[PDB]
Enzyme design. Structure first.
Site, PDB file in Angstrom:
ATOM      1  N   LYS A 298      -8.701   3.225   0.111  1.00 39.66           N
ATOM      2  CA  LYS A 298      -7.927   3.635   1.362  1.00 39.66           C
ATOM      3  C   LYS A 298      -8.417   4.740   1.975  1.00 39.66           C
ATOM      4  CE  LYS A 298      -4.920   0.018   0.770  1.00 39.66           C
ATOM      5  NZ  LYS A 298      -3.983   0.718  -0.403  1.00 39.66           N
TER       6      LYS A 298
ATOM      7  N   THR B 267       0.773  -1.337   0.181  1.00 41.63           N
ATOM      8  CA  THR B 267       0.014   0.154   0.098  1.00 41.63           C
ATOM      9  C   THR B 267       0.750   1.251  -0.040  1.00 41.63           C
ATOM     10  OG1 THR B 267      -1.840   1.140   1.119  1.00 41.63           O
ATOM     11  CG2 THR B 267      -0.174   0.175   2.336  1.00 41.63           C
ATOM     12  N   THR B 268       0.341   2.415  -0.380  1.00 40.45           N
ATOM     13  CA  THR B 268       1.038   3.866  -0.305  1.00 40.45           C
ATOM     14  C   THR B 268       0.043   4.873  -0.118  1.00 40.45           C
ATOM     15  OG1 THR B 268       2.424   2.815  -1.875  1.00 40.45           O
ATOM     16  CG2 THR B 268       2.584   5.167  -1.572  1.00 40.45           C
TER      17      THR B 268
END
Lengths: 241, 132, 237, 198, 233, 245
Positions: free
Chosen positions: D33, D1-2
């Site tokens: 997210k 994830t980022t």
């Protein structure tokens, strides 16, 4: 029968709860009055606003609370009890939204508060806090909704109701006005509520000695009308009446 | 005030020269201000004067409308409304063309559809209507 | 009354609460004690009673942590309970913070603890009045606490049965305090107890207890022959 | 994830990739997210999805109740503080790192970063997630104080594109959300709207 | 009478009465008329939903409520206590379903609700439920109609009435009720028994009726109640 | 007796709980505490009664610091007042620990009011026998002043007065342009009002306790400095002589 009177849990020989009845008398003790009416696509609550001092901050003085983003209430009775029950209603609505993922229906919130009050009426731990809560909201499938949550666990839904000293007079006036074209618009509903209060109290309202909260299908967020809006309603509707 | 009743004569002159509603609206705004100030004397003079101006004009479909309005406005002062209706009755008795004066009689009656402070005036109006 | 003084939970129909007043009366069933303070000392002096000429004289000065002592007037059960609580609080403060508990904070703790009973129906108000003598870095302190859960910071005070004589003496002579040697201070306290004593009675080493705290002097209780240097020096009426 | 957040005068832009792996397999490839805490406050989540979602829901409940009770819009600091309390208390059970960015009348355009643990640090630009490191160094050079909303949007898009390119656990679409007085504007860069080499 | 022994629920009066539970039953008898008739192939419950005004939205709070796909319940007495008891009955039915993968028998649900009422009538700080419940179920292949009292006692009924005019209702049911009565005729009997104690015009929207046949308990819609009233009149 | 005035959990046959009213009577028997909300601050004044020459100066303070930025002025049973001050301090501490910023005074007043209502609900505890005022000032919320009473109502205020001389204090406060005064002058007005309402032949001894929280303190409540209190006291005595003249 006066012996069966000092305890909330004692039935009178004829089966009456005198302490609950006294809680209702306590409702009729703040002096103020409140009225609520639902049109086709809106609901309106209007409450008498007494500020008997120049030093009292009218902004803080109020009986209209925003239980959630789309539900409002007008409280009548003891102020401490009113605010306690308002906090309880906000907490219950937040819990409902947390657990079930959608906003609490007005009827559900009324049932929750009525159950909370019935618990106190049955067990002997607290006194039944003496306040009456009139809730208004917009239900996606039913439409505008007005409800009461009296301090005995009774919460019937209403086309139009009143609470406080002049609840009987307001009820008679609203019965007469609703037997004839109950179908009201936004302006007509505000007219009916304000006129009911004015006629029952035998006084014409300044824009400040009255507080109005409104919900509409187009804008289903509890809005407390400002002084300018209240004055506009009063002047325009008195003129064109 | 005296300033009110000296700026009102110019309005009378304008109405005589011809003012269908401009002077009417000017006087309505003035009366709004006076009533909000709660000046019973100013309200009384303004109301009696506006009805007087109408009657001096042709006023047909205008005097009755103005009376309906000034009666149905915000919480007009008791003495102000009493004086207006008394003036209009004293100017009603001195009218003719009954098929048309009947409309003014009805307008006054429905403005006085019942009020403790105009009871006698409504009674006299009803008697005149019955005679007619 | 007669239905408004059965418990602390009922207000009388005058804005008055009766069991607290009854506890404040119980404080007067004790014995006279006078506390007072100079600018570098604090002295409690107590008139110890006697239940019989054989039985010893009941102790009236108790030793809270080294910089604090207490003089009690009222129910001895509540005196013991409050003394234990004060000792525990002082020990806890000296354990957490490596310094003595301030007297003005110890008295606040006592006030909260004694106020709790005065509002809930589970117990009675602590029927004991206290004179707390202490020395913290601010300076010598004399405090009074009453069963009502109210505490007063007194420059000199007296409590117990026959207290107004000592209180009037203190009001008259408090201008002398502050700039007094320890001996003069103790002498003034003993004079106050003499004033509260019945005329025929007098202060004897048997019935006088003298607790002293102050700078470079940890709370010391002088009883029995320890008070001889004070009573002996004391002038006679 | 980022996940990333950049502060600009009067507002703030959040951005996040849309990958949710369960090993080497993308269980969800359009995961959202970004989560709206109250109305303007947003949280970008990283770490275990279950813990992050539970924390976000609990914080949403708490902040909604708080704001309704106060009759005032909540503070980004208040939301990040609720996140900090929960994360710090349950350090040992919560494998979650969050970035709380939003706008409030008093201190509009705020970005706090509560990484693994219980930290509480405001930043002009915050970065988190497994693929953070690369774009982290890249933004250390690229960032310049005084950006506007459009420059911040391009900055976040390029950063997340780099992280997605160089990180196996990040990839999919890039979701952006610009928050300011006017409100929240959310958009997505699917396959071509996102940079190719930078 | 025994005046001293009427304020407590944990003391026998010298004659053995538990006066407070009888007072609760008086509160029950001073409630809205409700009727229950056990037809040959079903059960029917009725109760007046007369409101104190035209303003009361008579579609929000119901008095004949389901508890399962095959059990329903009406009451005579206080509405708040009724709400508590219906919630508890639903919870008990769900617990029984979870334990035994089978809808709770009507007899068992009545036993457990009566146990709840007993729990509430065994202390000094608690007020007995001031309601009487009429439970109607279709367990097994035959209908069941039960009554539950504040005292914790539960009955099986052929037909009964409770509320203000229960004496007249029971006399009427003695006159009119026959065991081999189809549900369609039992609905008419129920509505007529209500009429015999219903002041004012029994409009379709101020009366509430619920049937319980092999298809499961169901509250009749106001249109259906209007049709039944028209056919009866 | 009435028969319904024992326990705060009993409603008389009028809807009145008499224990709360008796608590209100108890508070309406103490010294006078007033508070005025000027444009850039709030000033509390209290006419503490020195009940003996033995008590040292500053004993029985009725002005507490309930959180750094909020001051509390009490009137009634001082034991209950101290307990309520501790409760409010704990509530403010909990707020700053949970949410991370100074508690808004509106919220603090609501919390303490709910606590007082908790104690007026039950029969196992008596209603708090004191009223009090909460004042504060901040850049982002502005000067605020609230009053709490034994029944647990938290109405905001511009000028408030609790105790024996409340009606007279409110009468003397109405004749003030507080909405446009500054702290440096509203302090003198507070001292003057307190001296005027104070009764010398009934209460004998007297001590004026002043505090302000306002812009000139960076929103930090504190006791008015010695020199300022002395000047305000001198002005109040001079004004008393002027009014007598």
């Amino acid at each position: 029968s006066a012996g069966f009177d000092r305890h909330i849990t004692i039935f009178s020989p004829e089966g009456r709860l005198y302490q609950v009845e006294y809680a209702f008398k306590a409702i009729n003790q703040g002096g103020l009055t409140s009225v609520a009416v639902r049109g086709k696509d809106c609901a309106v609550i209007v409450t008498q606003k007494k500020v008997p001092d120049k030093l009292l901050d009218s902004s803080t003085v109020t009986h209209l609370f925003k239980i959630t983003e789309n539900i409002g209430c007008v409280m009548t009775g003891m102020t401490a009890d009113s605010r306690s029950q308002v906090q309880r209603a906000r907490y219950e609505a937040a819990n409902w939204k947390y657990k079930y993922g959608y906003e609490i229906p007005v009827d559900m919130l009324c049932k929750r508060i009525a159950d909370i009050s019935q618990v106190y009426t049955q067990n002997a731990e607290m006194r039944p806090l003496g306040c009456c809560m009139i809730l208004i909201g917009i239900d996606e499938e039913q439409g505008p909704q007005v409800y009461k949550c009296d301090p005995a666990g009774y919460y019937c839904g209403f086309k139009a109701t009143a609470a406080g000293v002049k609840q009987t007079e307001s009820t008679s006036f609203l019965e007469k006005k609703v037997k004839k074209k109950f179908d009201w618009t936004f302006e007509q509903t505000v007219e009916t509520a304000i006129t009911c209060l004015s006629t029952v109290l035998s006084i014409d309202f300044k824009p400040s000695e009255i507080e109005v909260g409104v919900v509409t299908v187009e804008n289903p967020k509890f809005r407390i009308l400002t002084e300018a809006e209240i004055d506009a309603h009063l002047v325009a509707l008195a003129e064109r009446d | 005030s005296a300033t009110v009743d000296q700026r009102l004569p110019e309005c009378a002159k304008l109405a005589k020269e011809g003012r269908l509603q401009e002077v009417i609206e000017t006087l309505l705004s003035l009366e709004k201000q006076t009533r909000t100030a709660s000046d019973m004397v100013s309200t009384s003079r303004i109301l009696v004067a506006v009805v007087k101006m109408c009657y001096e004009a042709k006023e047909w479909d205008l005097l009755n409308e103005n009376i309906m309005l000034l009666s149905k406005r915000r919480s007009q002062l008791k003495q102000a409304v009493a004086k207006m209706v008394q003036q209009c009755c004293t100017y009603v008795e001195e009218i003719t063309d009954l098929p048309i004066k009947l409309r003014l009689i009805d307008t006054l009656r429905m403005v006085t559809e019942g009020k403790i402070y105009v009871e006698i005036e409504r009674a006299r109006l009803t008697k005149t209507l019955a005679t007619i | 009354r007669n239905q408004y003084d059965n418990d602390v939970t009922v207000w009388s129909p005058q804005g008055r609460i009766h069991q607290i007043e009854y506890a404040m009366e119980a404080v007067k069933q004790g014995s006279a004690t006078v506390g007072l303070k100079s600018k570098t000392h604090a002295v409690l002096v107590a008139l110890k009673r006697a239940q019989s000429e054989l039985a010893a004289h009941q102790k009236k000065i108790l030793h809270v942590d080294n910089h604090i002592g207490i003089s009690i007037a009222g129910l001895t059960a509540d005196a013991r309970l409050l003394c234990n609580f004060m000792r525990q609080e002082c020990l806890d403060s000296r354990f957490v913070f490596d310094r003595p508990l301030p007297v003005s904070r110890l008295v606040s703790l006592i006030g909260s603890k004694t106020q709790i009973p005065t509002q809930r129906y589970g117990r009675r108000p602590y029927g004991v009045g206290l004179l707390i003598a202490g020395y913290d870095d601010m300076g010598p302190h004399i405090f009074q606490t009453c069963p009502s859960a109210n505490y007063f910071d007194c420059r000199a005070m007296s409590i117990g049965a026959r207290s107004q004589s000592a209180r009037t003496y203190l009001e008259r002579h408090m201008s002398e305090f502050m700039e007094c040697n320890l001996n003069e201070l103790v002498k003034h306290g003993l004079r106050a107890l003499r004033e509260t004593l019945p005329a025929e009675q007098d202060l004897t080493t048997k019935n006088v207890s003298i607790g002293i705290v102050g700078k470079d002097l940890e709370f010391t209780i002088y009883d029995d022959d320890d008070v001889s240097p004070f009573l002996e020096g004391l002038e006679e009426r | 994830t980022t996940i990333m957040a950049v502060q600009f005068d009067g507002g703030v832009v959040l951005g996040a990739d849309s990958r949710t792996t369960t090993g080497s397999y993308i269980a969800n490839r359009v995961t959202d997210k970004l989560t709206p805490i109250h109305d303007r406050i947003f949280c970008c989540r990283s770490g275990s999805a279950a813990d992050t979602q539970a924390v976000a829901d609990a914080v949403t409940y708490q902040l909604g109740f708080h704001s309704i009770e106060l009759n005032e819009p909540p503070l980004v600091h208040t939301a990040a503080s609720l996140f900090k309390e929960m994360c710090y208390r349950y350090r040992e059970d919560l494998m979650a790192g969050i970035i709380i960015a939003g706008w409030d009348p008093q201190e509009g355009g705020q970005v706090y970063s509560v990484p693994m643990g219980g930290m509480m640090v405001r930043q002009s630009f915050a970065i988190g997630g497994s693929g953070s490191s690369y774009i982290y160094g890249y933004v250390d050079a690229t960032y310049r104080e005084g950006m506007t909303k459009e420059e911040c949007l391009q900055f976040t898009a390029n950063a997340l594109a780099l992280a997605m390119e160089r990180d196996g656990s990040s990839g999919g679409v890039i979701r952006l959300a610009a928050i300011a007085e006017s409100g929240v504007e959310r958009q997505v860069l699917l396959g071509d709207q996102i940079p190719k080499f930078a | 009478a025994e005046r001293g022994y009427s304020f407590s629920l944990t003391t026998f009066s010298p004659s053995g009465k538990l006066v407070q539970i009888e007072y609760a039953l008086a509160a029950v008898a001073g409630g809205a008329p409700s009727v229950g008739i056990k037809a040959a192939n079903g059960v029917v419950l009725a109760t007046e939903k007369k409101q104190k005004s035209i303003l009361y939205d008579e579609r929000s709070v119901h008095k004949v409520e389901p508890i399962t796909k095959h059990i329903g319940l009406v009451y005579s007495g206080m509405g708040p206590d009724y709400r508590v008891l219906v919630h508890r009955a639903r919870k008990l039915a769900q617990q029984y379903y979870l334990v035994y993968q089978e809808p709770i028998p009507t007899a068992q649900l009545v036993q457990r609700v009566a146990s709840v009422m007993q729990e509430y009538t065994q202390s000094g700080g608690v007020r007995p439920f001031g309601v009487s419940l009429l439970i109607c179920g279709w367990n097994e292949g035959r209908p069941y109609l039960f009554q539950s009292d504040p005292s914790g006692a539960y009955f099986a009924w052929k037909a009964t009435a409770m509320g203000k005019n229960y004496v007249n209702g029971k006399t009427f049911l003695e006159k009119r009720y026959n065991e081999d009565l189809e549900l369609e005729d039992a609905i008419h009997t129920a509505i007529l028994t209500l009429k015999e104690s219903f002041e004012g015009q029994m409009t379709e929207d101020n009366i509430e009726v619920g049937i319980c046949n092999e298809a499961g308990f169901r509250r009749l819609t106001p249109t259906e109640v209007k049709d039944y009233l028209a056919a009866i009149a | 007796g009435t028969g319904y005035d024992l326990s705060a959990s009993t409603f008389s046959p009028d809807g009145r709980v008499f224990q709360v009213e008796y608590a209100m009577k108890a508070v309406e028997n103490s010294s006078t505490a007033i508070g005025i909300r000027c444009k850039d601050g709030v000033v509390f004044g209290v006419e503490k009664l020195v009940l003996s020459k033995l008590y040292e100066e500053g004993s029985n303070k009725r002005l507490f610091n309930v959180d750094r930025h909020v001051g509390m002025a009490v009137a009634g049973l001082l034991a209950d007042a101290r307990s309520l001050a501790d409760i409010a301090r704990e509530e403010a501490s909990n707020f700053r620990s949970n949410f991370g910023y100074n508690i808004p005074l509106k919220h603090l007043a609501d919390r303490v009011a709910m606590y007082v209502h908790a104690y007026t609900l039950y029969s196992a505890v008596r209603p708090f026998g004191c009223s009090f005022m909460l004042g504060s000032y901040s850049v982002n919320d502005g000067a605020q002043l609230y009053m709490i009473d034994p029944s647990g109502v938290s109405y905001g205020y511009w000028g408030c007065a609790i105790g024996k001389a409340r009606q007279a204090a409110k009468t003397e406060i109405e004749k003030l342009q507080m909405k446009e005064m500054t702290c440096r002058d509203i302090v003198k007005e507070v001292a003057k009002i307190i001296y005027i309402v104070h009764d010398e032949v009934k209460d004998k001894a007297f001590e004026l306790e002043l505090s302000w929280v306002g812009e000139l303190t960076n929103g930090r409540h504190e006791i008015v400095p010695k020199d300022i209190r002395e000047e305000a006291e001198k002005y109040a005595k001079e004004s008393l002589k002027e009014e007598d003249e």
